Amino acid sequence: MKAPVRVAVTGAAGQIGYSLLFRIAAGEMLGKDQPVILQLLEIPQAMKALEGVVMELEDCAFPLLAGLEATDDPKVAFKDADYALLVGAAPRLLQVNGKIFTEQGRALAEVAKKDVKVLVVGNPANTNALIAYKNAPGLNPRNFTAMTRLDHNRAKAQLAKKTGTGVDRIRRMTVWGNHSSTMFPDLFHAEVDGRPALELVDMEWYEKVFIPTVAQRGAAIIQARGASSAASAANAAIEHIRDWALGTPEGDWVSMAVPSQGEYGIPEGIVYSFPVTAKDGAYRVVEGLEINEFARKRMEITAQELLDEMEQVKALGL
Amino acid sequence: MKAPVRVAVTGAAGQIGYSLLFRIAAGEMLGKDQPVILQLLEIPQAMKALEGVVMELEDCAFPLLAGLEATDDPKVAFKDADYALLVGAAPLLQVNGKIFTEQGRALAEVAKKDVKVLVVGNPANTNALIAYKNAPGLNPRNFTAMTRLDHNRAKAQLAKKTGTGVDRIRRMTVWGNHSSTMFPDLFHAEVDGRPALELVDMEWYEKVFIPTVAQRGAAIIQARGASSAASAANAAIEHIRDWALGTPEGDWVSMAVPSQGEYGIPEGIVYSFPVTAKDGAYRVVEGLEINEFARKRMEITAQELLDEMEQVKALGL
């Protein structure tokens, strides 16, 4: 019934975009009652391939796809966007990523809706989201986020498997920090069918199996498939946006990397994964948690990495 | 939260699978209240890649994915299957003969008696034929092939031309099979409750629409450097979904199903008809007036499928 919303998506002809766009047009991201207009962006070199993706989207005959355009100019892609998924990044320099997210930052602040919701997916996501909101004058910095939902989902999957519990009964999972080898999956607050996770697993498995498995999971899939985890990444992005926009379940929370306002003693400014609830299009960092020494030490090590990256970005005036 | 159903999918680590499995596991195919168990089949050389796909599905934390296994053994993949999506085919007629003879047999041996079978791998109509012929004990009526992609392509082209939403287009039909000689039918199709030819003309229908639909797959390969995996997967999902959950009232879809001899289509071949579906059963729309322009074009694929059916018999498949 609702009026259409505009969804901008970059890197739209790449593997993540190919897994992402069809499910967005199907209504899996914002609901069955919410028509979407897709505004897709690519580099000029990939525009030919992007037109092929457009033909396929058309070929699904999606009833919620209320509009569809493809461009290589950010000021057209971001034009009156309500949502902006920044999937495309440097092909793998902090130089290149810097120029992308500065350009895309100012473009968003130029032509997007004032309360546009921004999700950075391309790595390094946390620092790219930093560069982006930093160069987005007039836009609330808190509308800029980066994705740790995949680590979140990966962590949850390993816990369900270990405890013989369905994933739908795993709640209050948390991944702190950035999307990197220093990320911290937190089982001290996680619940398995209403029991504390560490009632059902002990510390040695946590430290020696669970944390390394989640942290190394991307490399394993690359090993098996000969390609990165596009589909589970895209599903993660979809859920990141969906929970942000439609709300988190009562009693639960998710991981979102957001500009730190100092909570849990995390340095201000940097984009950092927190436990969050979301309601009516707005997230709130979950307060009132107790942080022990093991958690604290690992949360600080991610923070330091992010602080290192921030001071390096500032070293280039970005 | 109904009891889970088992869904078998072959060629699971291929491009179409990679687009398929995640939407299925999410509940897009059978509904949000229907848990599924995915039983994934690949060839031995692809099992390593398939394990990667398994990891990825797990990493989505899908609440409706009640189970998940990977195997290179059809008798394992198809065990107690309620649905079977036969996506993997030859990467010729000999090779497909072996594949779909074996998979028809596996299905007979171990799948549910009322297992709904969808053949996606090309040439789908004949592969479905070989599979139902080698499936003693299963109903031939449950063996189907996909023409939903062409159907959907055709809708997309009619919508673009008339400037209306795709949701105002109903009763599209693509007769025959997934091939260049397929027949998209505008004589029965409707735009906003009006006959399509009151909104577009015969010349455009003839010289633009029909070849545009037939050449579409090639146009996508030319653009992406790869085939239509995602829209193919989407067509497969809707094929099953409409079959399972029913078609909208006043509407119908295309499905290639065993012909019983109607509409001048030789009996026994699998052939795309306009069909409705209600309660997991499909029914060919009957009593449509067919004109000679259409009949002639339908018979091209009807006769080329009949030839394939005879050619398959001569090879004892």
Numbering used by the authors:
A (entry chain D): 1 to 92, 101 to 326
B (entry chain A): 1 to 91, 101 to 326
Publication passage describing the model:
To gain further insight into the co-substrate recognition and activity relationship for TtMDH, we attempted to soak the apo-form crystal with NAD. In addition, we found a mass of electron density in co-substrate binding site of TtMDH that could be modeled as NAD. Unlike the apo form of TtMDH, crystal structure of NAD-bound TtMDH belongs to the P212121 space group with four molecules in an asymmetric unit; however, a homodimer should be formed with identical subunits in the crystal lattice. Residue 42 of TtMDH is a glutamate, which hydrogen-bonds to the adenine ribose instead of the otherwise conserved aspartate in other MDHs. The NAD pyrophosphate is hydrogen-bonded to the backbone of residue 15 and 16, but nicotinamide ribose is hydrogen-bonded to the side-chain of residue Asn131 through 2′-hydroxyl. However, the increasing B-factor value, slight movement of the binding loop and few structural elements around the NAD binding site indicate that conformational change is significant for TtMDH activity.
MDH from T. thermophilus (TtMDH) is more similar in amino acid sequence to NADP-dependent chloroplastic MDH than NAD-dependent bacterial and mitochondrial MDHs. The molecular mass of TtMDH in solution determined by analytical gel filtration chromatography was about 61 kDa, so TtMDH is a homodimeric enzyme like most MDHs.
